[PDB]
Amino acid sequence: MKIAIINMGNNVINFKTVPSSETIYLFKVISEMGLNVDIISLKNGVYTKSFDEVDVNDYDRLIVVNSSINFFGGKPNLAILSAQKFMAKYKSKIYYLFTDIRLPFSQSWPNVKNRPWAYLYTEEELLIKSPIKVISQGINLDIAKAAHKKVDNVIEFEYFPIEQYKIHMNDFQLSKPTKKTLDVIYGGSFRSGQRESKMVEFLFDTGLNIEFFGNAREKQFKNPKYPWTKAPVFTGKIPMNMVSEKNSQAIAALIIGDKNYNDNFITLRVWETMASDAVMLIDEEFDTKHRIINDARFYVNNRAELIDRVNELKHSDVLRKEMLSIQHDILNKTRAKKAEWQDAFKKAIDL
DNA sequence: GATACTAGATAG
DNA sequence: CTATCTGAGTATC
Ligand SMILES: O=c1ccn([C@@H]2O[C@H](COP(=O)(O)OP(=O)(O)O)[C@@H](O)[C@H]2O)c(=O)[nH]1
DSSP: OEEEEEESSSOOSSSSSHHHHHHHHHHHHHHTTTOEEEEEESSOOSSEEEGGGSOGGGOSEEEEEOOOOOOGGGSOOHHHHHHHHHHHHOOSOEEEEEOOTTOOOOOSHHHHTTSTTGGGOOHHHHOOOSOEEEEESBSOHHHHHHHTTTOSSEEEEEEOOGGGHHHHSTTOOOOOOOOOOEEEEEEOOOGGGTTHHHHHHHHSSOSSOEEEESSOOGGGOOOTTSOOSOOOEEEOOOOGGGHHHHHTTEEEEEEOOOGGGTTTBOOHHHHHHHTSSSEEEEEGGGGTTOOSOSOGGGEESSHHHHHHHHHHHHHOHHHHHHHHHHHHHHHHHHHTTHHHHHHHHHHHTTO
16 A cells, blocks of 8 residues: 655645645654655655656555645746646546645646647646545535536545644644743734635734734735724744744634634644644634534634733733643543544545 | 745626 | 636745
8 A cells, every 4th residue: 555645736845835834744644644655746855756756656545735726927837737747647536635725626727728838738648537536624515515616527525624633743742831922823824815804803903912924914905895004913934833832922822714614624723723822712703613612711703802802811820821721631632532533534545 | 047935806 | 706817026945
């Protein structure tokens, strides 16, 4: 049994980019299950073998981390072109890891064929004919199917909480008490404005000391429907392996999601925040039944409630420490079901 | 004539 | 909002 995992549209090297990081963590967690897996990317490297140096059909299973098909600058995107070229030659079922609602599987040929540099490729090279099974991080398979309505070779849909890989890694450990220099923190990208309303509501004009780290930029928030005057402090992106330690600099860390994530997706930040030294404050809309933690104190309905909850936490170390103890305990209860999670993943990829 | 990383705008 | 069209600014093993 030999498994290959690739990221469909991003180079994989280290933890400097989120797409590369996710691919490496998945490679790592699968390896820790006792499976023989290789990451195939553009070049040979510490964690990867090159697309041009292996035979895709030497693998019994081909796992593909989702990505968009974006030819930046209208120019060829080697990551996506090489990945689909690799996928097109595979003669078995492909397992598409659907971890981001914005990234459903799609064919690149229909996009490439109308490009001026189309002559560089052919339908035979890029058209993926293998059947695809979508492993949805979201429990709602109707949303997953709707996202893939345009493609016809996707024949299977199954839910699996992929993002738990963070807490099941062999070397996982909760964050220790950390010096507090921030009231609230949130790390991520602009996500093409798919979450602008929520970001503005909970992170802007709060009067609190807030930091927004990641690839998001102040200039990106310009939708006239979600006005603001004061912004949080935007800082640069950091390696994914350091996210919980970064979150730990704040009294609290925010949990929000895209509309289609509400009561559907559990995201990496839920675990990264839960494991940090920052109290997890969740947007009520994201988890209306409080399935994450059965304690209303961890939930906020709007900006005013977030402000009040944060001040309560700063005013009472006893309360803050109690809540951290609780979220840490809840996380451990899920970590206790590691074997169950590993087995379910194996079955998801027909093993 | 560097190279790597990262969808935004417009139409229907 | 979904389908379709257009195609660059910032950061650097
Ligand atoms: O500087 C940063 C900011 C974010 N992240 C990662 O990016 C994820 C968030 O991704 P995204 O912006 O797509 O938001 P989501 O939809 O996951 O909430 C976080 O959970 C981290 O794992 C990271 O590695 N570095």
